[model samples]
Target chain A: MRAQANEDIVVSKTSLWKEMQYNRDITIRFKFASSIVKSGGLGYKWSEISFKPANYQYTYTRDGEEVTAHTTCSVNGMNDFNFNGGSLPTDFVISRYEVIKENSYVYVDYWDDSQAFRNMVYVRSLAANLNSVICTGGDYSFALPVGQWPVMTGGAVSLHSAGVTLSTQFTDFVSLNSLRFRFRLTVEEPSFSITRTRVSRLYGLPAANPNNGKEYYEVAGRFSLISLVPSN
Target chain B: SHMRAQANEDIVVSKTSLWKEMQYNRDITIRFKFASSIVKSGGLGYKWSEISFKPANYQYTYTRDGEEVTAHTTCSVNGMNDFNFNGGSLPTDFVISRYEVIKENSYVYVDYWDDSQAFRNMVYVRSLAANLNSVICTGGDYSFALPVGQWPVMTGGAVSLHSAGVTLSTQFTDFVSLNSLRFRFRLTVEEPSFSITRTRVSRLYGLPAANPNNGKEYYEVAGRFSLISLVPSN
Candidate 1:
């Protein structure tokens, strides 16, 4: 399936580039979960698998087996499976494009292209039955404004709904008896690139407190795609 | 609890004759017809008298002098007594060694011998062993045409040869098998330059009552390898 591009490539009110120029720090992370059940009832289970640095050449490890995987990027503001509005921008930075193959499962993670946070982005399996849209029940949270560069400040986005939360598990990961699941992610940014030098920090909450307004900022960051591993 | 058997040379009638004498003493001169005779000995001053038997076994008969004289006796010294005038008996004078017939328009040919036939123009013979049953000489010839998609080939003899100087070596052991056999020849051509493609197919002889739809039943022919050479060698 093809990605349907919006007629206009404008971000939502919260622009990652503008916020970054304001010296605000932005970060994104992906949380993956998969449950595998082999036919003989002896199987493996993986949940809340996490990665760090959200950059190209990242290592994927399961049960301590790590492999070098990378993310590929598109500049025309287009994606892997679709044509963009025009030629991609030359400045688009690709953080990662990696296929994580474990015993019975495969994981694909695309990190945040914005150089500001270097946070790992969510990658998911395709929905069991649909191909055109991303799976529901995944989450994205934009941590509130941080850093100090004068001007209006203090903003964030957080998803507490189980439907938009980004967590997944699989019954079978390898053996390829079936198709790989669908996966998509959101960068939650104003544009393909983000600048990082213009923002002020606000302090009124604890550091780890979920209620801390500083830990949540919102951006338009959701990417989705059908995962069809073509038969060789 | 009664039984009797009889044998004859010249004319040894069974005991039924002696019994008939005791019962009715009917005066009779049993006569047998002699159709064709063969002499087994020399010097016969005493020619064998003949009597009449059944006419169905006689090949030919004639009347003379207002009386039907015997020609071939049923149990005669000659073996011709068992001959069937209506042409019904084993080891008949003629045997269909081979048969073939082809429709007018079709390239498919069915024969009992030399099962293969060339697609393009070629020569054909109607030898007694060459049983050609159907020929479709023209594309529009359906009377002799095989069904739309079926072709059966029948092998003539146990040995076959290729026309293009191809030597086919076969032996008696080739036909020592216990059951039936079949052969086929398939020729395919594709002229990409002229945009012409042709596939010639044929079917051999088949059982009269065998149904084509009752499974894969059809006339099949047998043949040796085919010498297929292209005119404009590509």
Candidate 2:
């Protein structure tokens, strides 16, 4: 047996950037959480989460020829869980951009019941002559975010009351982009079931926007679960 | 009875096989952490962390009419982030001079600069090999130096020592089957405001080495951030 859930979220331009396209800046905030069940006494294990960009490219010239490269950013190695019990919500912030002539960098701040708080940043040169590309000059375009949960036993599992809130800022315009969020709960059991899959899309400013004085936009989506058992 | 526990163990062993048989897809994820001795300042900061990669590839085989057939498999590195910075924090001036993303030995070297101080930071993934030593200078004057290890430089490989408006063409072992390369850059300005111009380069190719540290190797391709200026708001 197989089951799945899909949803759409929209983010506005003005909320992220006032009038700063030429500066080449972007910021993203993500919040995600879910409920789960297991087959036997063994519970489910949280595997990994991946964020894929729709259109990120790099261009450079070598030996009088030009080349363009493309890739995605994936963060694995996750080990936060409640084991036989359920879990609370988890969230993180990914802020990225370029300095005038100094360097370009990415800062990631994450929070959860396991570690409570953790953060890191990666910095590279901004003055390098190679052509770099990002998601700009089109309709609002963002990458797809995916979550995975795997069970150890041959029993069934359900994911209920799971959701996410994604807010982004673009330096260029005041419009919004079209995006999709996916969540999956997998078990090796030959038979499985899904109790509930709920989804919602809300628009407006995020309650915690630092610039609350100015208006902003947000996209929030959620899911739910029931139960699963082994088939003999 | 003692026999009941034995039955439970047998059941678990059977279930483990079923789980492994069902899992056909393979995936790998790496996570790490790093720090700088310098206080966070300016509009940017620098960090070097360790990420580990274990080989993972999926293989499928089937029969075509009368003969058995299997699909070939290879790994490639695709997708990454671009230049970006945080406005809420003070920026530190730092540039990534060199990086190592291979098995056996992996490290990243960076140059940090400010009005009052300057130094180089080297971050490495801990290894049991006691013979491993620092290949580049630890601290003193700030200079761009490659790590002290065996790097694969091919025939067309090139290196230019110019600071601004310069490019170098070099080839190295492509372990990890990486398909993309992240280039490091720096720009000098006559004034506070300046624009960056970049062009595409032809992709280079090389042979794969059994061990990345042995000598020359090949990386698989696939696909492939932040900081600084604020004029202020009126």
Candidate 3:
């Protein structure tokens, strides 16, 4: 139904920024395995599929032509369904007296393994969302040498097998009377999440010192991939 | 199988029948500096001038639902008279030159210095569309998804000036062919004189359940923030 894992995000250490909420300026970058940055799949059966984001497509021969479309994991014309860190393809930079934000969306796709069913077109689909904010900065900020900076958090993923027909093109295949191979990808629960934030002192504290008193700022960047499924 | 997924009504309204909640809110902060044109040449015994504003952590307590609540500065554009000498009384001269928010990727540029083109108090911040007001919720973080197209314009309906100080608020809804969401903002005077304006924005919206371009079916994500000073005006 669902799998759980740890987090891969804005930790104060190797990610970016520093302590001391006064003068902050720097640019940081992280190189993650390309596998995690993008999702690629080939020849997947009910016996094998990963918890990472994916674009599940269903194809069949109709009349004289081949029709292919994504039954689930489809948005902005992309079928990968994997997490995007917004600015993963570039560096993280900020100017003085300003703070930046990053948010992650949790997703799920339903795959029906029972391809022999009739009402199969009603089941294939996907879902995603994230949460609000907090006054305290990221946890790792205060723990590290630098002071704590405000943080953004979210990320959950899963796959499923429901007995319903999930193909959006079921009507097109009904006339041919082809027994379908049904599979559903769903997210029952995903414990995986991401943390995003910059230097704790980039904006400085209130009252005693309200400004960083600088001309520019800096941020650290990372591209993360979801892996190692532990289901319950 | 299954599926999912305006400007102005500056009020929060989703096509779906779900009430707007504070938990799933997206937020961001943009600081603006008011640089003066300097017209000081004997104005009959009295002096006249203006200044602009920047960042740092801060704190405040406002009335939420008629209750005094403490809210930390999620992000601020603390106003400062970076020039020199400040002695301007209330009911002074204040004007909003220009203001607009663009729906851009993560490469946000925040340097708002006047290169002789725009006037003082011109506010422009780019990124995913969001509210610029403080939110009353359990947590405080700012993030948003880019709308359907790249770099569409999302701006406040109007931005007027403040003499004795002004309190401006907005709640807007923007819907494109592939995306639809709502956002809101509330701005009031903090310490008016030195141009200390206290305001915040919150982005509260959602995308369709799936995105073919995104394996995670993510609505949208942004990168790099480039913005500058939030000084004061005297």
Candidate 4:
């Protein structure tokens, strides 16, 4: 699998909560693309191919302590695919492939939870006088409480281990030499910014036939954080 | 207000207008009722699945020219489905019914149907005050807008579907049935107001043993409609 040029994958960590202050809602827009190649027999085909967020987590401070939550972010693009194995042309085969493009959005509602409620009064107070408090002497500075800042970390999309498999007798293929996936995250706030993350993995196909012919491999990658600026 | 009636009694309909204009910033409620008897048959089983809006649409308007255009909204709450069986009776059969409610893109949809048979599946899309503007608008100087409130009041519960079925083998000649059939779908929208306008249901069947050697057939059904309508309450 390989990513198309100019296509990048990224994740943003715009601060929705700083200390006891809660910022406005944050939305993360994502775009990604990848291509898969079959470098073996013409009879071999791809089936049940899919890519989705596997292990993702978002962290924040609660009760003066850091707490991490496993977040389930819905994605739309290249989630799944299925093709009849026996429908491909047998005589004309050598490196057949397919490219997948995916786009999705993730809305982070930071103020709609227990942690936000814990600082309700303080948040309300800050919001009420935010303008006057943040601007003084021709300089803007909202002095946030000295505490742990909310941090979003550790999220990745993994190509499922069983994502690809060959049909019947078309097993004469070398190992998958190259695999690349790219994604980009765009954020709108104090400044418009974009972040890109890319991952590459390589695997060797069966060098020799196995006893059962049902061999498999696994590869994983993660998106990089682009920006984590605090909203005034 | 609540009222109770005795069995076999009729409720009189004497009101001149059954619906009234919904007020801004007020919450809307919906309820439905269905029949108890089940309809069963070969490869199909179903039951009554009907839904009704509390404050049905009596009158609404959308501008066309420089005039106050008015239109009466008369939509029934009837969107439901049941699993259809083709080969034969289900491996295990029992009678049961359940209700599933989903919130997506700030709209709420309720589905009431029986899981026992492949008869009928009905769904009703309802809208809260916060989500009314996105569905229908009066346009221009006559704009219908909700107050400054939490947009997309509720999240999560975006609907998704998956299925596995049996497919005949495309391999060497023989009466072969493979259970590796699968299906998937991906939906995308560019803005906050994006929604799946409509969804239709259909069936797909693999080729029979006697038919010529051709790939299995995949069929699709399509339809469209506004999920939520805001009108007056009777």
Q: What interface RMSD does each of the candidate structures achieve? A: 41.3, 18.6, 18.8, 22.1
Q: Each model's DockQ?
A: 0.00, 0.02, 0.01, 0.01
lDDT by residue (B9-40, candidate 2, tens digit) is 11111123122111011111111112212222
Model 3 bad stretches (over 4 Å): A1-34, A37-52, A56-59, A63-65, A71-160, A163-232, B1-181, B189-234
Model 4: C-alpha RMSD to truth?
A: 26.2
Off by over 4 Å in 2: A1-162, A167-232, B1-228
lDDT of 2 by residue, A65-184 (tens): 443322222112222212222332221111221111011111112111111011101111211111121211111111113343221211221211122222221101111111112222
Clashes of each: 104, 69, 81, 21
Ranking of all candidate structures by their TM-score, best first: 4, 2, 3, 1
Q: What does candidate 4's lDDT look like per residue over B1-234, in tens digits?
A: 223243111122222232222211211111211122222332223211221122121223333223443322211122222232222234333212222221122122222111111101111123211211122111011011113322211111122221111111122111111111011111111222211111121221111111111121211111111112222122
Give per-residue CA lDDT, model 4, range A119-202, as digits (tens): 221111222111100000011111113322211111222222111111121113422111112222221112211111121121
Judging by TM-score, tell me the better candidate of 2 and 4.
4
Lowest summed-lDDT stretch of 10 residues in model 2 chain B?
Answer: B116-125
Error of 3 at A152 (Å): 31
Q: Write the number of the candidate with greater TM-score, choosing between 1 and 3.
A: 3
A1-232, model 3: which lDDT tens digit per residue? Answer: 2222212221122122211111111111111011111122221101111222233344433333444423222111112222222332232211111111121121212222222122221111221111211211121111222334322222212212122211232233432211122122222221122234432222211111111232211111111121111111
Which wins on lDDT, candidate 2 or candidate 3? 3
- Candidate 3 structure lDDT: 0.20
List TM-scores for all candidates, in order: 0.13, 0.17, 0.17, 0.22
